Design a protein around this motif. Structure first.
Motif, PDB file in Angstrom:
ATOM      1  N   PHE A  59       0.825  -1.206   0.000  1.00 29.01           N
ATOM      2  CA  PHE A  59       0.000   0.000   0.000  1.00 29.01           C
ATOM      3  C   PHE A  59       0.864   1.262   0.000  1.00 29.01           C
ATOM      4  N   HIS A  60       1.800   1.341   0.941  1.00 31.79           N
ATOM      5  CA  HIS A  60       2.718   2.476   1.005  1.00 31.79           C
ATOM      6  C   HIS A  60       4.155   2.064   1.322  1.00 31.79           C
ATOM      7  N   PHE A  61       5.103   2.714   0.659  1.00 29.21           N
ATOM      8  CA  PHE A  61       6.509   2.483   0.933  1.00 29.21           C
ATOM      9  C   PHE A  61       7.324   3.719   0.563  1.00 29.21           C
ATOM     10  N   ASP A  62       8.467   3.897   1.215  1.00 30.58           N
ATOM     11  CA  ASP A  62       9.274   5.093   0.990  1.00 30.58           C
ATOM     12  C   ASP A  62      10.183   4.931  -0.223  1.00 30.58           C
ATOM     13  N   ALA A  63      10.691   6.047  -0.725  1.00 33.61           N
ATOM     14  CA  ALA A  63      11.634   6.009  -1.829  1.00 33.61           C
ATOM     15  C   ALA A  63      12.881   5.220  -1.428  1.00 33.61           C
ATOM     16  N   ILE A  64      13.491   4.543  -2.393  1.00 33.42           N
ATOM     17  CA  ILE A  64      14.751   3.870  -2.143  1.00 33.42           C
ATOM     18  C   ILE A  64      15.840   4.738  -2.731  1.00 33.42           C
ATOM     19  N   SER A  65      16.859   5.023  -1.940  1.00 33.08           N
ATOM     20  CA  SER A  65      17.893   5.934  -2.384  1.00 33.08           C
ATOM     21  C   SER A  65      19.261   5.296  -2.230  1.00 33.08           C
ATOM     22  N   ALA A  66      20.191   5.667  -3.107  1.00 28.47           N
ATOM     23  CA  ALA A  66      21.550   5.143  -3.043  1.00 28.47           C
ATOM     24  C   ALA A  66      22.599   6.235  -3.239  1.00 28.47           C
ATOM     25  N   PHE A  67      23.700   6.116  -2.501  1.00 29.82           N
ATOM     26  CA  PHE A  67      24.808   7.075  -2.531  1.00 29.82           C
ATOM     27  C   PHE A  67      24.411   8.443  -1.980  1.00 29.82           C
ATOM     28  N   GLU A  68      23.641   8.454  -0.899  1.00 31.02           N
ATOM     29  CA  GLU A  68      23.436   9.719  -0.204  1.00 31.02           C
ATOM     30  C   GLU A  68      24.722  10.058   0.553  1.00 31.02           C
ATOM     31  N   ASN A  69      25.588   9.056   0.706  1.00 37.53           N
ATOM     32  CA  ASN A  69      26.965   9.262   1.161  1.00 37.53           C
ATOM     33  C   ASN A  69      27.891   8.266   0.468  1.00 37.53           C
ATOM     34  N   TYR A  70      29.138   8.648   0.208  1.00 34.58           N
ATOM     35  CA  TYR A  70      30.114   7.707  -0.368  1.00 34.58           C
ATOM     36  C   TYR A  70      31.538   8.258  -0.314  1.00 34.58           C
ATOM     37  N   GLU A  71      32.523   7.361  -0.327  1.00 31.79           N
ATOM     38  CA  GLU A  71      33.928   7.748  -0.469  1.00 31.79           C
ATOM     39  C   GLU A  71      34.563   6.994  -1.634  1.00 31.79           C
ATOM     40  N   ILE A  72      35.086   7.713  -2.619  1.00 35.73           N
ATOM     41  CA  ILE A  72      35.859   7.035  -3.656  1.00 35.73           C
ATOM     42  C   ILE A  72      37.277   6.811  -3.133  1.00 35.73           C
ATOM     43  N   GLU A  73      37.628   5.550  -2.915  1.00 37.48           N
ATOM     44  CA  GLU A  73      38.935   5.175  -2.384  1.00 37.48           C
ATOM     45  C   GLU A  73      39.950   4.953  -3.491  1.00 37.48           C
ATOM     46  N   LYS A  74      39.476   4.410  -4.608  1.00 31.29           N
ATOM     47  CA  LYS A  74      40.330   4.107  -5.741  1.00 31.29           C
ATOM     48  C   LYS A  74      39.518   4.218  -7.017  1.00 31.29           C
ATOM     49  N   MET A  75      40.110   4.825  -8.038  1.00 34.38           N
ATOM     50  CA  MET A  75      39.490   4.902  -9.351  1.00 34.38           C
ATOM     51  C   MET A  75      40.581   5.107 -10.412  1.00 34.38           C
ATOM     52  N   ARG A  76      41.100   4.005 -10.942  1.00 31.28           N
ATOM     53  CA  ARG A  76      42.290   4.050 -11.781  1.00 31.28           C
ATOM     54  C   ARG A  76      42.380   2.837 -12.698  1.00 31.28           C
ATOM     55  N   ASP A  77      42.440   3.079 -14.006  1.00 26.16           N
ATOM     56  CA  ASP A  77      42.764   2.028 -14.977  1.00 26.16           C
ATOM     57  C   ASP A  77      41.918   0.757 -14.862  1.00 26.16           C
ATOM     58  N   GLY A  78      40.615   0.897 -14.629  1.00 21.37           N
ATOM     59  CA  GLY A  78      39.744  -0.269 -14.579  1.00 21.37           C
ATOM     60  C   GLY A  78      39.564  -0.853 -13.192  1.00 21.37           C
ATOM     61  N   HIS A  79      40.168  -0.210 -12.194  1.00 21.49           N
ATOM     62  CA  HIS A  79      40.050  -0.653 -10.807  1.00 21.49           C
ATOM     63  C   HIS A  79      39.361   0.401  -9.972  1.00 21.49           C
ATOM     64  N   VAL A  80      38.309   0.009  -9.264  1.00 22.58           N
ATOM     65  CA  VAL A  80      37.530   0.972  -8.488  1.00 22.58           C
ATOM     66  C   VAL A  80      37.179   0.399  -7.123  1.00 22.58           C
ATOM     67  N   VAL A  81      37.373   1.207  -6.086  1.00 29.95           N
ATOM     68  CA  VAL A  81      36.882   0.891  -4.751  1.00 29.95           C
ATOM     69  C   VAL A  81      36.122   2.096  -4.200  1.00 29.95           C
ATOM     70  N   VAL A  82      34.900   1.855  -3.732  1.00 33.38           N
ATOM     71  CA  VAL A  82      34.062   2.903  -3.152  1.00 33.38           C
ATOM     72  C   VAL A  82      33.423   2.379  -1.869  1.00 33.38           C
ATOM     73  N   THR A  83      33.405   3.195  -0.819  1.00 33.01           N
ATOM     74  CA  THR A  83      32.738   2.818   0.427  1.00 33.01           C
ATOM     75  C   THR A  83      31.501   3.677   0.653  1.00 33.01           C
ATOM     76  N   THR A  84      30.513   3.108   1.334  1.00 40.14           N
ATOM     77  CA  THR A  84      29.292   3.828   1.666  1.00 40.14           C
ATOM     78  C   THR A  84      28.671   3.249   2.938  1.00 40.14           C
TER      79      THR A  84
END
Lengths: 122, 122, 122, 122
Positions: A1-26
């Protein structure tokens, strides 16, 4: 009947982003959750998909989604810190395949996904 | 380097929710989009996953996610009205399988997904 | 330690093959089975994949496999007559998506698969 | 109109089968191929699925198939020696997830698959 919006990445840290390798925390917050108080299936997928997109960008490519798959292994909970790790496991002339895994702060595996993308160009 | 949160179901209409059949409509807004101004891959997935969850509820069941798949067929755009249709295509003793399709206001097919769930109980 | 070869289409009937629509029947024999005497997972997949390939041919296209998915719903048994039905559910400029379902002689659903292919050309 | 049976494991060597780790080699022969003279999509899948089944056996478990996925990366050819490597990447109370990769004799990646199984018991 009722449900709240689903949200993603309202917070995050990009730890690594290089040459096809990515690490992100949330950190899992209230808007991340479903009815039962676990991390929403769409939320966890969105976490992976976004990091997949970053892997592609990190390669200097433009990509468009084609097909994606995910396995759910263990529930995410409020206040969990989720580490999202992406890698391009195949770089083809016209397609790419990304593998993305999420682990929680205890090192436990939460979910694992695979993204098959079309290379729009450089 | 920087990107905004991805959000889903900041608006929606439940049109049908009965005995394993679900139809939900939603309008694509700015928080639905990726860098290129298309409906985000995670957003479209979350749309499907949530409706899958509703199919399960409509059957009087409790479910937990196991594995999910999605095909992306045509881009969603700002102001599109997306119709999300879910059906249980297999109800097993211990698992369920849901098929979910999204079509836009022009009747064009946007994406199609399949959800394999474990029945936690009644 | 030891197991026999798994074989598919040692017998078959093409019932329909026209404009993206394909129906093929086959009888489950001993070489179709796994250790437990059920239709082998690879066998059922191969049934679907081949019919997917026929859908593509029926459209006058040449295709190459990219990504494929399958759900197993009910076991196949020796002497079952399996009806394999394929359809192209999306024909894109550069890709196609095929849905393929198998039902047994009692009308029960056995498995269901989806094939994402790249169009090599006309 | 006409096509030959597709067969898998008419030859094979089990190199490793221990505690959830499996390596099996096989040589691509004529019955492995499709119309275009490449390793058949169903053949490559069957290779992976069988090795997945061995991983499960190696754990002292009985399993039944639920959902499976595969990415095709590079074509297999007649006389290729394919190395099939399986691992259980998640052992749950009631389900298992197997990852299986195939590489050819030149070390090139041919395909990669994921199997989600239900544990029938010990």
């Amino acid at each position: 009947f009722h449900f709240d919006a689903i949200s993603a990445f309202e917070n995050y840290e990009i730890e690594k982003m290089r040459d096809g390798h990515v690490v992100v925390t949330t950190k899992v917050v209230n808007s991340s959750l479903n009815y039962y108080g676990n991390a929403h299936g769409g939320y966890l997928f969105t976490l992976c998909d976004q990091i997949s997109g970053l892997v592609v960008i990190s390669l200097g490519l433009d990509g468009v989604a084609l097909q994606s798959s995910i396995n759910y292994l263990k529930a995410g909970k409020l206040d969990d810190v989720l580490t999202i790790k992406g890698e391009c496991v195949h770089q083809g002339r016209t397609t790419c395949v990304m593998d993305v895994d999420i682990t929680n702060q205890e090192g436990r595996n939460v979910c694992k996904a695979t993204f098959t993308m079309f290379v729009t160009g450089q």
